[PDB]
Amino acid sequence: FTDYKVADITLAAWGRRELIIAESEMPALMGLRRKYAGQQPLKGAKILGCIHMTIQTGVLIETLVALGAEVRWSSCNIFSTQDQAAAAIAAAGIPVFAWKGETEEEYEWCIEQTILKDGQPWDANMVLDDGGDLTEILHKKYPQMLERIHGITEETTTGVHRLLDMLKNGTLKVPAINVNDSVTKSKNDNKYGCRHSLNDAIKRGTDHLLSGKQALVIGYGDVGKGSSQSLRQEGMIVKVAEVDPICAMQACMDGFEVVSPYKNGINDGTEASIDAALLGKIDLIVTTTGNVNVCDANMLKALKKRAVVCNIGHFDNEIDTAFMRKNWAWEEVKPQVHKIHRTGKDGFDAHNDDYLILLAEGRLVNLGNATGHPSRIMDGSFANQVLAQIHLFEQKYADLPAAEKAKRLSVEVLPKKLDEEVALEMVKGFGGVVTQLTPKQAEYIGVSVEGPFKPDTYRY
Amino acid sequence: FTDYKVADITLAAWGRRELIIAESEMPALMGLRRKYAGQQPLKGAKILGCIHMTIQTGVLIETLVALGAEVRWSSCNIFSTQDQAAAAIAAAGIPVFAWKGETEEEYEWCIEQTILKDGQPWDANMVLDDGGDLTEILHKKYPQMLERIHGITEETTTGVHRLLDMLKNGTLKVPAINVNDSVTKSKNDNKYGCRHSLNDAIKRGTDHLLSGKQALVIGYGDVGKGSSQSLRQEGMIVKVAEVDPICAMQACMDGFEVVSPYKNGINDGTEASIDAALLGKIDLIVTTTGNVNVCDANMLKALKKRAVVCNIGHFDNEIDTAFMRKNWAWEEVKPQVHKIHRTGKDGFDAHNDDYLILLAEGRLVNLGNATGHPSRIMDGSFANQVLAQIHLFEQKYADLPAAEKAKRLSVEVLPKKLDEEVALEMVKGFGGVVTQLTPKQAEYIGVSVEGPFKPDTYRY
Amino acid sequence: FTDYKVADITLAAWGRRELIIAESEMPALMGLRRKYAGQQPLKGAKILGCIHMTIQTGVLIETLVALGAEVRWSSCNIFSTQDQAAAAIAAAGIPVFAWKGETEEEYEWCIEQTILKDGQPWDANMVLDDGGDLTEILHKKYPQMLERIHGITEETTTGVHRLLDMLKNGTLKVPAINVNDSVTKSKNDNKYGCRHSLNDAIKRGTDHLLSGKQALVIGYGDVGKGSSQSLRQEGMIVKVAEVDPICAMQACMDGFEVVSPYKNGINDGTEASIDAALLGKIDLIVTTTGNVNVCDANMLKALKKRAVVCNIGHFDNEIDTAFMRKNWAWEEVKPQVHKIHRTGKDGFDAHNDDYLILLAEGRLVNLGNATGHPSRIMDGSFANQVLAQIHLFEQKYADLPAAEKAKRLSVEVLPKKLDEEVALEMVKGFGGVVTQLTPKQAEYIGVSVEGPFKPDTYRY
Amino acid sequence: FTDYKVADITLAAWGRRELIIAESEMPALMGLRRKYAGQQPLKGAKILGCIHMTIQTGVLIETLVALGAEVRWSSCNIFSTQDQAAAAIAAAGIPVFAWKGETEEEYEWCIEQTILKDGQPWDANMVLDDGGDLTEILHKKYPQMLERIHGITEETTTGVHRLLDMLKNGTLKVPAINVNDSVTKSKNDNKYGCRHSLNDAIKRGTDHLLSGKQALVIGYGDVGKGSSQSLRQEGMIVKVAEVDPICAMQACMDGFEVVSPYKNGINDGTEASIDAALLGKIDLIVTTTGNVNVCDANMLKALKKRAVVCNIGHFDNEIDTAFMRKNWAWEEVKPQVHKIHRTGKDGFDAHNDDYLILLAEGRLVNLGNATGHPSRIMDGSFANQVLAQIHLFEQKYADLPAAEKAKRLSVEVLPKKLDEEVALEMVKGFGGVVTQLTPKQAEYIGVSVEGPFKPDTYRY
Ligand SMILES: NC(=O)c1ccc[n+]([C@@H]2O[C@H](COP(=O)([O-])OP(=O)(O)OC[C@H]3O[C@@H](n4cnc5c(N)ncnc54)[C@H](O)[C@@H]3O)[C@@H](O)[C@H]2O)c1
Ligand SMILES: NC(=O)c1ccc[n+]([C@@H]2O[C@H](COP(=O)([O-])OP(=O)(O)OC[C@H]3O[C@@H](n4cnc5c(N)ncnc54)[C@H](O)[C@@H]3O)[C@@H](O)[C@H]2O)c1
Ligand SMILES: NC(=O)c1ccc[n+]([C@@H]2O[C@H](COP(=O)([O-])OP(=O)(O)OC[C@H]3O[C@@H](n4cnc5c(N)ncnc54)[C@H](O)[C@@H]3O)[C@@H](O)[C@H]2O)c1
Ligand SMILES: NC(=O)c1ccc[n+]([C@@H]2O[C@H](COP(=O)([O-])OP(=O)(O)OC[C@H]3O[C@@H](n4cnc5c(N)ncnc54)[C@H](O)[C@@H]3O)[C@@H](O)[C@H]2O)c1
Ligand SMILES: Nc1ncnc2c1ncn2[C@@H]1O[C@H](CO)C[C@H]1O
Ligand SMILES: [Cl-]
Ligand SMILES: [Cl-]
Ligand SMILES: [Cl-]
Ligand SMILES: [Cl-]
Ligand SMILES: [K+]
Ligand SMILES: [K+]
Ligand SMILES: [K+]
Ligand SMILES: [K+]
């Protein structure tokens, strides 16, 4: 077996030990293996996967394979692979093209190695994506392959936005499931995963004390909620920025001061608009938005000396790292940790005090500087992925006549009953005991004893 | 002026001082007063109101009046009135029939005094309700009045469930707005209000140390989330019960142990099914469900001696207080605080150690033993109420032709843009500064710079 | 029986019900009753007591009486009495002179009624004091009575400071025990009691939401630690001031921003030295120092409109309330809650926005606006009081010859073994289980299996 | 230069970059460098140092050298060295013998290389120790060297206990300073350091989600306080064991349930005495005691399958790892992470579910699996070390006449004024501003405006 490319195949046994531990931390996903292994619901599925090649993703891949699938895999970020996980998957005879510290050229080459087998398009019929890069390449470069693909299952709110833009423009070629919008994904992974992993990554990269220091979290959606908690629970003094007044209300009620980098919140592009007094007191800035240029050049210029700058949104463009590359000298401390010297670009002084510390070159910091979300949290997201793969594969969209395809071409979420079933396995993993409604109580609130327990409008 | 009934009109000046302070804590609601006072959008409205006669409700009532309405008011709970608030409203020449410590007969009489003026139905044309009791009485006993009513604005998730049952059965006679499902209601009031007011009520009633003691919170919806936090932040060791596995998942991730009162969660009605070991260690039980008999007779029998029992859901039927009335002796400590002696019903021993402490006779504890939610939280709920009253009044359902009425007979929520506008005023009240999107950023995420900022599916 | 003065003797039965509950919350104190009742170690003791006449103090008084003492009692603060507690004690035939809302003249008259019985000095032979006022009156006005007194047991760090000044000057006439410096007093009561009771008092007085608002806590000793936690756990954004860099270090590490009201910390008496920007953002100031004028006139002038001002240190002079009385108009909201109108002193405008809310007229806010510390915390302080009374009474200093008195005239703390025994009863009250050392383990760390477990230098 | 032994000298540049960052996080220690560099107070000092060879210790070493000292260094634990720190120190021409993953034989050899230079005793005249191993070797094996040594500065509460045993027995040969008992050491490092670094180490070793899982912390001294917080802030459900009722009282008040591994707390050595129900629910056990066999063989047998076991006390003997070595098979996952298979000793099944995960082979977990305490915390401990070295070096005990030596042979602490001065530099590092007392306020509380601010009895 040679149809793979990883950093170091001798890391496989270490990865396999970590996969075995992870399986014990992932009861929803393992439960699906056990439930469906007889049936082989993914027999004949040929899945192109593009998602962070971590130990958690290894358990996902091996679940899909245990259910009958074949796969070809790549990472969706240049710094997120755990090389022992990639090695263990390759050593199992699964095609994977992923290593920590890819260049952009290598990143694109890895996705292409999944798409092509022996120099020609693979017989793919399903896509599992995280962020939409693989989806975009297939639509732009490999439309013939999409003719034979039954569906896309997309992990991220960023990627879903990209799918919805395509649907609106009539350019989406295959149906999709929005995995993000399961409650056991968005209100588990996006929030509690970042709670676990943000402070982890900052400690691993810097070993800085966080207690007593000042942080600014840009955004207060699910990731910004989790991130703010990650830092506050360590004793940081956390301030929060938002454009959405409802999320800002939540931040206030949650005990944070809501501030803007700009005077009166007005971002008009001048240095004069920056709240220099505010930014000059910040020790750590974290972007969480999924938006562009939310930690901009003028903000970077105004930050307190020796501040840490990082991004936990999907794509690096949240921070103006291009400005920093053009203007300032980068001193690498160790992989994924750079001092950015604001003195200029013509070399640097190792003892200069006027620098910022950038983590993961602005790429997702939890995966870049640590190991991303823990297995017991990714259990929820990845159980949803498996259920979504099963649903779209069984629907067989590619084999439908044109008129029937037109009725099915949509971006949908999984039903609440399945979200509940995933949650129950997670709860049992903690040793939790859910109460069963009596028939009188189920009648009283208007639900089945089996669920679903909430209307689709419920926000949790 | 004599068209009122309150405990003590001499409390009015104290109430008025507290209304003036509350106005300073309610910027959304005060902002609506300022914005709409010229236009008089509620000129000609005649509103029957049934909601807890607190200081916060006084600010609501006076906003409605300032916008042009006439009202006739009662409380929706026998213990929730603040007598100084009722007095201040009556002293202002507004019909109010409410006092703390009503009997059930008096409660019904008060609602009837709003409905009848001078012994005949008042020419009401709007309803503001909290829990659905007024709505039910109008449908059952005064259906002719509904022929002239343009709509109902309902505060509570309980009352909305009741309205949806009526709609489904074809018995709802006028359209309604579900105020609860604004984010600035459900994810503000239900959660943060109970966070503020649950520990407040327990301290006022008992003066018990909470730190280091064991609590069981039944339910983990919005009220159970806020309640659990109210107790955990004081240092309680909190366990959480749930029937909904998604809510139970949240509780686990939030750092609580998820337990059932019943062995393996099976509530089969025998004493043998009670987890006596668990209940024998609990110092405080709080019900949050909106369901029936979630703290049942067998649970009450198994609780640790001297445990506190209370309910923060809308109706008292969450706890089997009828069982306690039939079997055990009640020693009143002070109003809304009773020791329930498990020794029997034939008198009590003042020094008996085998008792429970019941707060507010099992009625909503925050309002019964304290003052309910604080003004700055109720600002959100009550701004929504005013917007909802304006919308339904302006739509004039009662005046529509039959075919037009058929198209508008619905239970609806307010638009997200208005939810956002309420939130923004709340945030400004904390001194928060919301950032404005640049045109490029608004394009990038697919929103208007003015909002709304999220799709209707977003859960916050 | 007529040898008492209370607000309303008909409150006795309510007080007695609350005493019975409190006994169930005070296992250390009740354990001393049970242990020593046979022996009657306080038979012949005649105790002048001056400490907050709360339910908790009632349990203390009745323990002393159960052990053989007779007492005459007063409160040590004009606003701290719970009138039902005072009534219950009077109804039991115990001389008590205390009510909530005394004037200064009445306060002094009440202490004098304890000292004098039937117009002549009582046959006192012990003193229990909280803050040193009774101790001072005896030394200045009744030195003949001190000849027959065996000792003073003093609750407070303020009062201990006053005792140590007297000892140093050679004016202390009888020995004392510093009850404060038991760990089960200072590191229980001073910290966790204020954690429980500060937010309680502010809610009762104002009903303000605390979450999301800005607080300044002046001091970070035991009370400032507890107070800061009381507010932070509610979601306040808390800043801390200190003069002691070690306590300030603790505040930083605990996750607070450490600030001064004065520019660069320099308090030189001018308006120019005030950090107006800082004070203009503060919603709540709490003094915790035991020092003088730590919330001074210039600070008061600079506070944000509608800020709440309160003091939880023993004496009101922490806040310059005299300045406010001389310059600004006081609008009483309700007892212990005043709006202080910064517009001037010539009447007030009920709708003026430029006011501060002062709680308890600057007197200890927890006792003034709520009920002070909870029974389960006061159990520790008051068990120490009883042990201290027993020790000094048994030593019989007054009966010693002059040369022997000279050897015993000291201010001392209780031995660690007794502090440990109190703590063990508290722990058992929570259902806690302490592990017993094996003989090998006790040898390994150099302690007895029975304790004491730490050297006297240990700080906990 | 060849007088060193490290893992990899090519790591030096990386170490030096991390030292430069650490200097920016250590203002107290850097401030001492600046203050004393002119004076060279350690000119002629020849310091044998034995303390964890981390980046933080590198800043300490280079401060000592900057003040005039020569040193010879080793680590005090086999797993605590950061190889890049050791390399940087060796590359600077400083003798260091330390690497991560020493054997016990290598550990002893490294200490011997500090003691011997060119095969003969070095002319050492000062000792800096952490845990007492170097001190013991000098007293037992090299007593002639102690004739020329002016003093020992000891980091740890374990090592101080060892010094006090020697003093009591008349076997201590040179005076010592107890560095641990500075408040800026014990109530900074022991508490907040473990708060930072315990959860860090567990995440690095296992990548386990902690939220929602059950932990047992054995001990509630400074390390157990910080450790419990490290876990609770992540959402663990933490129970605490203690032998000291005062520490157990604190745990209850801090919101933890206090439990014993043994039924009724009685550790009589039989399996029957183990509370199997309790231990069978524990996911993580952490020992913090400084005692022996506090996680014993019978406890290990009863723990829930797949529990994590670790120790953060100074020595590994807290956990019965010898029992595990004799009876159970060890599967290495990666360095400092072993699965201990309870199935037996004859090989292991890679898929066995009945194992425990042991971190750092039971040695101090924060240093073994992460990087120990962060620089900004170690600044306090290490500033104290430098002050202590200066004091004892300047006192010149070895040169004193016999009668003079007898008066100075003691174990002492640094003065409070110096503790305060360290704290002040720490506070300024956070941007904190300490208030200066006015003359009137200093008089009122009986202190100098310059401090010290508290009596020596104050516990903070
Ligand atoms: N690193 C991880 O493991 C991880 C985990 C989950 C999600 N994500 C990624 O994080 C991003 C955010 O995801 P989410 O679920 O929080 O989305 P979300 O929509 O819940 O929240 C994003 C928030 O950013 C706010 N925002 C937008 N522009 C802003 C600006 N200029 N200033 C301040 N606030 C602004 C929005 O109002 C919104 O509330 C996405 O790219 C998502 O894919 C990363
Ligand atoms: N006292 C107050 O001020 C206040 C504030 C807001 C809402 N409320 C009332 O509180 C109630 C709950 O409101 P909410 O917004 O939390 O509703 P919700 O639907 O968000 O939550 C109720 C929860 O109870 C759970 N539940 C139902 N039966 C259960 C059982 N037998 N055991 C355990 N859990 C069970 C459900 O699964 C659900 O998650 C309603 O009656 C509402 O009107 C009171
Ligand atoms: N209300 C209550 O129930 C209650 C409970 C316990 C103690 N107390 C009282 O509270 C007071 C404080 O007691 P404590 O045990 O915290 O004493 P403490 O000595 O532990 O702490 C007082 C703190 O105030 C600081 N301080 C002094 N002057 C200051 C200034 N100008 N600015 C800022 N900080 C300053 C000191 O450095 C010290 O750390 C005493 O009067 C005590 O009797 C009240
Ligand atoms: N890993 C680190 O970085 C680090 C940091 C500081 C201290 N330490 C070490 O940690 C240890 C503890 O230090 P500390 O400052 O907390 O000491 P401490 O004396 O403050 O606390 C130890 C606690 O253990 C308790 N204890 C003793 N035997 C027990 C038993 N059988 N069961 C339960 N509790 C028991 C004691 O009562 C005491 O309260 C020492 O070995 C110290 O050197 C390690
Ligand atoms: N202070 C207060 N005034 C009026 N309504 C309140 C209140 N506190 C809680 N409520 C409302 O009471 C509802 C339940 O009947 C939930 C909440 O909207
Ligand atoms: Cl996402
Ligand atoms: Cl509701
Ligand atoms: Cl005190
Ligand atoms: Cl130590
Ligand atoms: K991970
Ligand atoms: K209220
Ligand atoms: K009390
Ligand atoms: K470190």
Q: What would the two tokens of residue A87 be?
A: 């090695």
Query: Tokens in use for C249?
Result: 């270090």
One domain for residues C109 and C227: no
Same domain? A236 vs A324: yes
- Specify the residue for token string 């638009």: B415
CA–CA gap between residue C144 and residue B58 (Å, rounded) = 61
CA of B203 to the centre of ligand 12 (A): 9
CATH label of the domain that carries residue A179: 3.40.50.1480
Of C385, C391, C419, C420, the active-site residue reads: C385
Residues of C in contact with A278 (CB under 8 A): none
Number of other CB atoms surrounding residue B264 within 10 Å: 11
Helix axes A83-91, A55-66, angle to 10 degrees: 20
- Tell me how far the alpha carbon of residue A368 is from its chain's centroid: 12
- Inside any domain, residue A425: yes
- What does the DSSP 8-state code read for residue C340? E
Q: Is B57 in the pocket of ligand 5 (CB under 6 A)?
A: yes
Phi-psi region of D182 (alpha: psi -120 to 50; beta: other; left: phi over 0): beta
3-state DSSP of chain D: CCCCECCCHHHHHHHHHHHHHHHHCCHHHHHHHHHHCCCCCCCCCEEEEECCCCHHHHHHHHHHHHCCCEEEEECCCCCCCCHHHHHHHHHCCCCEECCCCCCHHHHHHHHHHHHEECCEECCCCEEEECCCHHHHHHHHHCHHHHCCCCCEEECCHHHHHHHHHHHHHCCCCCCEEECCCCHHHHHHHHHHHHHHHHHHHHHHHHCCCCCCCEEEEECCCHHHHHHHHHHHCCCCEEEEECCCHHHHHHHHHCCCEECCCEHHHCCCCCHHHECHHHHCCCCEEEECCCCCCCECHHHHHHCCCCCEEEECCCCHHHECHHHHHHHCEEEEEECCEEEEECCCCCCCCCCCCCEEEEEHHHCEHHHHHCCCCCHHHHHHHHHHHHHHHHHHHHHCHHHCCHHHHHHHCCEECCCHHHHHHHHHHHHHHCCCCCCCCCHHHHHHHCCCCCCCCCCCCCCC
Identify whether C139 is a catalytic site residue: no
Selection from C414, C242, C266 nearest residue D454 by Cα: C242
Is the domain of A211 the same as that of A130?
Answer: no
* Residues B381 and B289 occupy one common structural domain: no
Q: Identify whether residues D196 and D290 lie together within a single domain.
A: yes
How many structural domains are present in chain A?
2
Contact between D155 and D131 (Cβ < 8 Å): yes
Task: Based on the fold, state whether residues C84 and C6 are members of the same structural domain.
Answer: yes
Which residues of D are annotated as catalytic?
A: 52, 75, 80, 130, 155, 180, 185, 189-190, 194, 314, 373, 381, 385
Please indicate, yes or no, whether residues A70 and A149 belong to a single structural domain of this protein. yes
Give the integer Cα–Cα distance in Å for D173 and D396.
Answer: 14
Classify burial at A347, counting beta carbons within 10 Å of its beta carbon; exposed 0-12, middle 13-18, buried 19 or more: exposed
- Reduce the secondary structure of B186-235 to three states and give it as a string: HHHHHHHHHHHHHHHHHHHHHCCCCCCCEEEEECCCHHHHHHHHHHHCCC
Q: Look at residue A182 and give its three-state secondary structure.
A: coil
**Sequence-ordered list of residues with C-beta below 8 angstroms from that of B144, at least 6 positions apart, any chain:** B121
A246 to B181: CB separation less than 8 angstroms, yes or no: no
Chain centroid to CA C377: 12
Spacing of C-alpha D289 from chain mean position: 13
> Rounded distance, CA D312 to CA D290, Å?
9
Q: How far is the CA of B218 from the centre of ligand 2 (A)?
A: 9
Pocket test for ligand 5, best of B75, B155, B186, B312 (most atoms within 8 A of CB): B155
For residue B176, how far is the Cα from the chain centroid?
Answer: 17
Which amino acid is residue D448, in one-letter code? Answer: S
Rounded Cα–Cα distance for residues A204 and C4 (Å): 68
* Cβ atoms of residues B47 and B96 within 8 Å: no
> Do the beta carbons of residue C390 and residue C67 sit within 8 Å?
yes
Q: Cα C261 from chain centroid? A: 26
Question: Residue D400 corresponds to which amino acid?
Answer: L
- Count of other CB atoms within 10 angstroms of residue B329: 19
Other C-beta atoms lying within 10 Å of the C-beta of residue B108:
14
SS3 category, C126: strand
Give the HSE-up count for residue C371: Cα atoms under 13 Å, Cβ half-sphere: 23
Beta-carbon contacts of C180 under 8 Å, excluding residues fewer than 6 positions away, are C154, C155, C156, C157, C159, C160, C186, C190
Using the 3D structure, point to which of C321, C343, C372 is the last residue of a domain. Answer: C372
CA angle centred on D204, ends D202 and D207, rounded to 5°: 75
- CB within 8 Å of A241: residues ≥ 6 apart: A216, A217, A218, A219, A220, A258, A259, A260, A261, A294, B435
**CA–CA distance from A255 to each of A191, A459, B220, B237, C215 (Å)?**
17, 21, 21, 22, 12
Contacts of D14 (CB under 8 A, 6+ apart): A333, A334, D84, D87, D88
Which two three-digit tokens encode residue D372? 């120990």
Q: SS3 of A396, please?
A: coil
Measured CA to CA, the distance from residue B27 to residue B63 in angstroms comes to 12
Q: What angle do CA C124, C129, C133 make, to 5 degrees?
A: 95
- Measured CA to CA in angstroms, residue B224 lies from B287, B364, C232, D237 at distances of 8, 13, 21, 18
**Is the domain of A206 the same as that of A196?**
yes
Measured CA to CA, the distance from residue C339 to residue C357 in angstroms comes to 5
B220 is in an annotated binding site: yes
- Could you tell me the end-to-end alpha-carbon distance of chain B, in angstroms, rounded to an integer? 47
Query: Which positions in chain A touch B265 (Cβ < 8 Å)?
Result: 433-436
Torsion of CA D346, D352, D355, D358, to 10 degrees: 80
Q: Indicate whether B444 belongs to any domain.
A: no
Q: Which of A176, A145, A184, A183 is nearest to A160 (CA)?
A: A176
Please write down the long-range contacts of A89-93, taking CB distance under 8 Å and 24 or more positions apart. A89/A4, A89/A15, A89/A53, A89/A58, A89/A61, A89/A62, A90/A1, A90/A4, A90/A6, A90/A9, A90/A12, A91/A9, A91/A12, A91/A15, A91/A16, A92/A62, A93/A1
Kindly state whether residue C64 falls inside one of the protein's structural domains: yes
Distance from CA of D337 to the nearest CA of B (A): 26
Q: From CA D14, how far away is CA A250, in angstroms rounded? A: 42
**Distance, CA of D242 to chain centre:** 21
Chains A, B: CB contacts under 8 A, how many?
203
> Structure tokens of C252?
């930083």
Strand locations in A60-100 (E): 70-74, 96-97
Residues C163 and A375: their CA atoms lie apart, in Å, by 61
Secondary structure, 3-state, B299-347: HHHHCCCCCEEEECCCCHHHECHHHHHHHCEEEEEECCEEEEECCCCCC
Contact call for residues A356 and A340 (beta carbons, < 8 A): yes
Of ligand 3's listed atoms, the one at least distance from the Cα of C225 is: 16
Inspect the interface and report whether the beta carbons of C249 and D184 lie closer than 8 Å. Answer: yes
Residue B239, classed as helix, strand or coil, is: strand
Q: Which residues contact D58 (CB under 8 A, 6 or more apart)?
A: D15, D19, D22, D85, D88, D89
Q: Cβ–Cβ contacts within 10 Å for residue C424, how many?
A: 22
**Residue B447 gets which letter from DSSP?**
-
For residue C95, say if its preceding peptide bond is cis, omega within 30 degrees of 0.
Answer: no
Q: Are strands A176-178 and A214-218 parallel, antiparallel or unpaired?
A: unpaired
CA D221, CA D368: separation in Å to the nearest integer?
21
Residue B427: its H or E element: helix B416-429
Contacts (Cβ under 8 Å, ≥6 apart) of D167 = D409, D410, D411
What contacts D249, CB < 8 A, 6 or more positions away? C183, C184, C188, C380, C423, C426, C427
When computed from its CA atoms, the radius of gyration of chain B, rounded to whole angstroms, is 23
CA B438 to CA B440: how far, in whole Å? 5
CA distance A451 to A417: 7
Whether residues B82 and B163 share a domain: the answer is yes
Residue A155 lies in a domain: yes
Show Cβ contacts of residue A454 under 8 Å, excluding neighbours closer than 6 positions: A416, A460, B244, B246
C-alpha separations of B245 from A452, B220, B238, B383 in Å: 10, 10, 18, 33
Q: Return the ligand number nearest the Cα of B158.
A: 2
- For residue A426, what is the nearest residue in chain D, using CA coordinates? D212
Angstrom distance (rounded) from CA D48 to CA B309: 64
DSSP state, A350?
T
Q: Report the C-alpha dihedral over residues B112, B116, B120, B126, rounded to 10 degrees.
A: -120
Beta strands B70-74 and B46-50 are parallel
Please check whether residue A104 lies inside any domain of the structure. yes
Q: How far apart are CA A363 and CA A365, in angstroms?
A: 6
The method recorded for this entry reads X-ray
CA dist D168 → D131, D161, D162, D176 (Å): 18, 11, 10, 13
- How is the beta sheet containing D257-258 ordered, strand by strand? D257-258, D237-241, D214-218, D284-287, D308-311, D355-359, D337-341, D329-334
Out of B82, B155, B157, give the residue to mutate to test ligand 2, the one with the largest number of ligand atoms within 8 Å of its CB.
B157
Of the candidates A9, A21, A349, A26, the residue with the CA atom closest to the CA atom of residue A188:
A26
Nearest to D212 among B212, B235, B255 (CB): B255
* β-pair partners for A127: A48, A152
- Pairing outcome for strands A284-287 and A308-311: parallel
Q: Could you identify the residue written with the tokens 């000609």?
A: B44
Asked whether B358 and B340 are in contact (CB, 8 A), the reply is yes
Residue B448 lies in a domain: no
C-beta atoms surrounding C292 within 10 Å = 18
Whether B208 and B184 have beta carbons less than 8 Å apart is answered as no
Shared-domain flag, residues D208 and D146: no
In terms of phi and psi (left: phi > 0; alpha: psi -120 to 50; beta: otherwise), the region of B39 is alpha
Ligand 2 centre from B130 Cα, in Å? Answer: 15
Is C447 a member of any domain? Answer: no
Alpha-carbon gap, residue C344 to C325, rounded angstroms: 10
**Same domain for A361 and A416?**
no
- Pair D268, D399 in one domain: no
Give yes or no for a contact between B289 and B219, defined as CB atoms under 8 angstroms apart. Answer: yes
Would you state the structure tokens that stand for residue C454, as one six-digit string?
């730490």
Residue D7 lies in a domain: yes
> Residue D250 sits in a domain of what CATH number?
3.40.50.720
Q: Which residue has the tokens 């200029």?
A: A344
Instruction: List b or e across A222-239, with b for residues whose CB sees 16 or more CB atoms inside 10 angstroms.
Output: bbbbbbbbbbbbbbbbbb
Distance of CA C31 to the CA centre of its chain: 23
Domain boundary among D372, D400, D418: D372
- D427 touches D458 (CB < 8 A): no
User: Containing domain of residue A143, as a range?
Assistant: 1-191+373-432
Are residues A441 and B265, on separate chains, in Cβ contact within 8 Å?
no
Cα C65 to Cα B350, C33, C45, C62, C97, distances in angstroms: 21, 9, 9, 5, 17
